[PDB]
Every structure is written in C-alpha cells, then in structure tokens.
Amino acid sequence: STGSATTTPIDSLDDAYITPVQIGTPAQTLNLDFDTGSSDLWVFSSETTASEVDGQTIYTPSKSTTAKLLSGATWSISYGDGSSSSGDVYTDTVSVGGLTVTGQAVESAKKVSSSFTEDSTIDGLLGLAFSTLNTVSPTQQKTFFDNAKASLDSPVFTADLGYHAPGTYNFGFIDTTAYTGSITYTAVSTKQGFWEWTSTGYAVGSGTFKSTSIDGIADTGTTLLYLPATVVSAYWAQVSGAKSSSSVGGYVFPCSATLPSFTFGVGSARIVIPGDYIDFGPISTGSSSCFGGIQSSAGIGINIFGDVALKAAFVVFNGATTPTLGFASK
Numbered sequence: 001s002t003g004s005a006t007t008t009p010i011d012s013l014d015d016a017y018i019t020p021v022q023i024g025t026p027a028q029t030l031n032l033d034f035d036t037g038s039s040d041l042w043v044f045s046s047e048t049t050a051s052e053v054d055g056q057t058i059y060t061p062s063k064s065t066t067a068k069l070l071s072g073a074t075w076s077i078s079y080g081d082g083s084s085s086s087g088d089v090y091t092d093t094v095s096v097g098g099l100t101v102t103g104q105a106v107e108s109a110k111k112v113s114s115s116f117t118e119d120s121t122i123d124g125l126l127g128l129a130f131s132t133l134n135t136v137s138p139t140q141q142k143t144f145f146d147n148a149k150a151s152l153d154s155p156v157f158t159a160d161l162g163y164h165a166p167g168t169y170n171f172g173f174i175d176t177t178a179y180t181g182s183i184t185y186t187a188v189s190t191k192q193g194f195w196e197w198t199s200t201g202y203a204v205g206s207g208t209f210k211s212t213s214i215d216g217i218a219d220t221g222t223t224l225l226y227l228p229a230t231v232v233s234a235y236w237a238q239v240s241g242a243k244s245s246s247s248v249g250g251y252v253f254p255c256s257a258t259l260p261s262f263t264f265g266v267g268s269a270r271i272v273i274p275g276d277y278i279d280f281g282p283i284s285t286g287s288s289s290c291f292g293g294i295q296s297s298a299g300i301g302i303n304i305f306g307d308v309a310l311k312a313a314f315v316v317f318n319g320a321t322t323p324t325l326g327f328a329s330k
C-alpha cells in the first residue's frame, strides 16, 4: 500500500504545515501537524476543556462506530517550545492520503496549553519520530508510520515541504519526479528516539564550505533551523545590522536586508537554503526589525534541522531495519 497527502502552510510565514487526516467511521477529517520530532498522534476532541478550544475541528469518538476506549491509558507531552497537552486514548481507524491503519492509538486531549488553543488552524499532531518516544502509559503505543509498516510497498515516508506553497507527505514510495539529481543517504541514530543524523558542514552565501560534524535531528514540527552558536554567528555576521536580541529571543536583522543563502552538507552532497527562506518577517506588526530563520541551539541541548532546512530538500525517512535519512535537491 501507499499514501499521498498534500501539506499546506498554516500562514504566510510557513510557521507550520497541516495535513488532512481521516479518523473514525464515518470519517472525521482533522488537519494535523505532522511532526518527525515526536511520537504521539493527539487531537482536539469532544473531551477537550471547552475554554481551551477556539476554532479547532474536534474528534468525537462517540460518533465513530470503530472507536474504542483504550481502557486505563493516559498520555501527557511537553514540547521543546514549552507547549503541552494531555488526555486519554481511543483506538480507531486513521487514514492519510488513502493509506489506512486500523487500531491506531488516537490520543484525545483533555487539556492543551495556550499555544495550541491560540492556533485555530492545527487540530492536533501526528508524530513520526520513533515509537520509543510515545508518551502513552502504561502501555506505550506505536506511531501511524510504525503501524503502517509492514502494509507499505517500501518502509519509508517522504517530506516535500513547500516554501510559501503546499507540499506533500508520501508513505510507502519515493516519487522520483519530485526531486532533481540523486538522493544522498546518511546514517541515523535512534538512541534518543529522533531522526538524528550528522551533517558534514556548512557554508554561508558564496563562502567556502566548512567541513565540520553537526549532529542534529530532522524535525518537521520545528519551524526554524537551530545550529551551534559558532555557525549561527558566522551566518549573521554576513548581514549588516543583524544582532542577537535577548528581548526578542534570538537573532534579528533589518527588514531592508537581502539575506545570504545557507548550505548544509549531507555526506559529499550539499543542500542550499535560499536567503529568502531565512526571513521570518517583522518581529511585530509594522516593525522594521525582522526575525531570523537560523537561530542558536545553545540551551536546547540538540541541533534541529526544522522546516527552514527541510523545505529546501526532498527528504526520505527510511524506516528499514537500519533507518537512514535521504536528502535530494528539488
């Protein structure tokens, strides 16, 4: 089997991407944030505290003929940005892009933090990191990808995120029309439950490539590119007037600037992030200070290849017995 679903930016900045997901019988379609940095499929629901729902579409298990309470199971998750959610668990039929899993754990939110209530466009998350990170207790649950394995033609999914445009998540096949050149594969460590890999270095604009190992994760659920302070300082030193602002919480730059590209290494291959991808616009409406898309990972404890980096590439998440990542230009 395969599946193919379109993913759409939630706003003009590509802050996140939503993908329609069918849950239950008859189908209830919710728009989920596919997150390769977490392992829970959780939704706004009929159980979510009413004052914490503002515009989201909810999953109502009582209206699904295939929903069953997963008796005793609870979940609670905290993300890298300080956001959180928790609740109870149902199993139900979940379909993405024509690919169906029966008996998927659907984690029903009873509580969500402010960042979720305040985002009407995101109805929940669909985690695509390794199932070892799933938070359900006392019986840990599998991701949608882990459950779909074995029906897939090839044990893979691909992320093809758009710049200010829709893109695609595919399950079970490589679309050889979706990228240019060849795919470069690189080793993955699953020790922390992430799609963790080691970039071979970087370049700023037209500058020379610096060969240096940068461990980090491929995380579709993180907006920005978070890299070591040395690398990030080297990038922003090429933008006149750029500075790190403690008040704003990262590097800002004059909105009148033209940003240089940023290149990262994948083995002997190179992925080039155009400068325009690194512009996240005014820090507040009407400001001439713009927020940078490359930020320091110091304090976060891991480097994160988030959407800024991933949307410059066609990315293969290879879930074979020995997982690997692949990157191609597009």
Ligand SMILES: O[C@H]1C[C@H]2CC[C@@H](C1)N2Cc1ccccc1
Pocket (backbone or CB within 6 Å): 015, 016, 114, 115, 116, 118, 119, 223
């Ligand atoms: O206050 C809420 C949380 C954030 C910041 C503004 C708006 C509502 N959300 C945009 C956003 C969504 C997904 C990822 C990154 C940013």
